[PDB]
Amino acid sequence: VTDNAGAVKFPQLCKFCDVRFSTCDNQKSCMSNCSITSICEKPQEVCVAVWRKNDENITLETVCHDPKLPYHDFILEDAASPKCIMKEKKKPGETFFMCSCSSDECNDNIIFSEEYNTSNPD
């Protein structure tokens, strides 16, 4: 089975759970629990994911968006990356994590180590 409808006449596909609770605690390869695949409304739009711990609650929101528009008063530009490369973001009063990629199913698994901790730290 393939993830493409045919040659390449379809828009980008991605996970779209909207606001959902999550148990992603430490960084380094986390995971989302929704399994809902949705197609991006436009080819220019990418896959943006955000994990936020509010005191005693963790939540991950996932939705397609255009990398040319700012988000939360910030300019989005890590979407060109095929996989999550942005490493956590400091929100005043909150720990907001930034992450945007342009690959089909890219929000089901989040990457917070590039080489998946290949360094093998002790």
In short:
The protein is an all-beta fold and 122 residues long.
Could you please describe the fold and organization of this structure?
Belongs to the protein kinase superfamily. TKL Ser/Thr protein kinase family. TGFB receptor subfamily. The structure is a monomer. The protein is built from no helices and nine strands. By secondary structure, it is mainly β. It has one domain: Ribbon (CD59), CATH 2.10.60.10. The radius of gyration is 15 Å and the shape is globular. The relative contact order is 0.25.
Features:
122 residues, five-stranded antiparallel beta sheet, globular, mainly beta, CD59, TGF-beta receptor type-2
Which class in CATH terms? Mainly Beta
Largest sheet: number of strands, sense, barrel closure? 5 strands, antiparallel
The ordered H/E elements are EEEEEEEEE
Shape: globular
* Helix/strand/pairing category: mainly beta
Estimate the helix proportion, in percent: under 10%
Annotation field: number of helices? 0
Tell me the CATH superfamily.
CD59
Number of strands: 9
**SS strand fraction:** 25-35%
Task: Estimate nothing, just give the exact number of structural domains.
Answer: 1
Q: Would you identify the CATH architecture?
A: Ribbon
From the alpha carbons, calculate the radius of gyration and give it in angstroms.
15 Å
- Calculate the terminal CA-CA distance, rounded to whole Å: 40 Å
In the CATH scheme, what's the topology name? CD59
Family: Belongs to the protein kinase superfamily. TKL Ser/Thr protein kinase family. TGFB receptor subfamily.
Subcellular location: Cell membrane; Membrane raft
Extracellular side: 1-122
Disulfide bonds: 14-47, 17-34, 24-30, 40-64, 84-99, 101-106
